[PDB]
């Protein structure tokens, strides 16, 4: 891959897969329709936090990583962030279900699939099993302003809500 | 593929998280371990049904709930293991089990890693998902084998149909 650092442009043609939340499909046992989400296009005029993690329903990810972003969402929005998105290698059906498991509604946090971890692979941040690694990006109108890969699979620090917040608070 | 009278293949290993009370919550994750199906099923009567994926429409609305409802009849016919199989990793299969309010081993929610078992019998699709199918395995021997004619077609692998082939 290529790695990403602050000051880099967000790559072009980045496409994720997801199921937009809807009231009719609010039950976790109800499935919606997966569609493409063109992050490069959607995020051109937005300030975005993208955090990736080993997978939906994994231990650290489920116990700390996603709950902390939910808890900090009001402060994150207070700092001008338009989109918060979690990313993993799981398909859109699973990411959708995970959003519901975490009692997220609307688009408060986007639960996005990186199909075959292809985006994460393209920047060198996927692991040997084809999972995305744990990392965070802050992308402000197409420019990377924060980028951190965790030093280990089960280490949550540089991609945490609280840490990303510190960098928005500057 | 497989057919009635075939032996269940050797060295078949799935991945799963055994349900436990302390991890009962969908947001509480256990740790995947290997499930040596060939070894475990040698002296048991087993239903294994595979499907395109956890949290997929037909699988979630009909395929799994119908097995859940028929569990008492299934057990009354001498079946020792009921397992659902999909290409999702064990974390996802585990959560799906909780989403369906299944506990213990009433139905096992099993991962076919990279659909490798399903590929080995030629019953995986071009995206690497398992197809929708069912096997009844009785002490290591296949007594029923069904592959659905399409991804969203539920008939020969349904609980009703498998129940009618439990003689
Ligand atoms: Mg017919």
Residue numbers in the entry:
A (entry chain B): 1 to 170
B (entry chain A): 3 to 169
Q: What do the study's own words say?
A:
Aspf3 wild type (WT) and its C31S/C61S variant crystallized as a homodimer and showed a typical thioredoxin-like fold. In the WT structure, both C31 and C61 reside in flexible loop regions (large B-factors and lack of well-defined electron density for one of the chains). The serine variant showed little overall structural change (RMSD 1.7 Å), with large deviation of the aforementioned loops (residues 24–35 and 58–64 RMSD > 4.0 Å). Disruption of the intermolecular disulfide bond in C31S/C61S variant extends the α-helix by 6 residues resulting in a significant movement of S61 by ~7–9 Å from the position occupied by C61 in the WT structure, analogous to the movement of C62 in the reduced form of Ahp115. A corresponding movement of S31 by 4–5 Å is likely driven by formation of a hydrogen bond to backbone oxygen of F57. The dimer interface comprises an area of ~710 Å2 and ~730 Å2 for WT and C31S/C61S variant, respectively. The slight increase in the overall dimer interface area for C31S/C61S (~730 Å2) is due to the fact that the loop connecting residues 24–31 is ordered in both protomers, whereas the backbone cannot be traced in one of the protomers in the WT structure. The WT, as well as C31S/C61S variant, exhibited close similarity to oxidized and reduced forms of Ahp1, respectively. S61 in C31S/C61S of Asp f3 becomes more buried, much like C62 in the reduced form of Ahp1. Therefore, we expect that the structure of the C31S/C61S mutant to bear close resemblance with that of the reduced dimeric Asp f3 WT. A three-fold reduction of the WT catalytic efficiency rate (kcat/Km) was determined for C31A/C61A, and a ten-fold reduction for C31S/C61S with t-bOOH or H2O2, respectively.
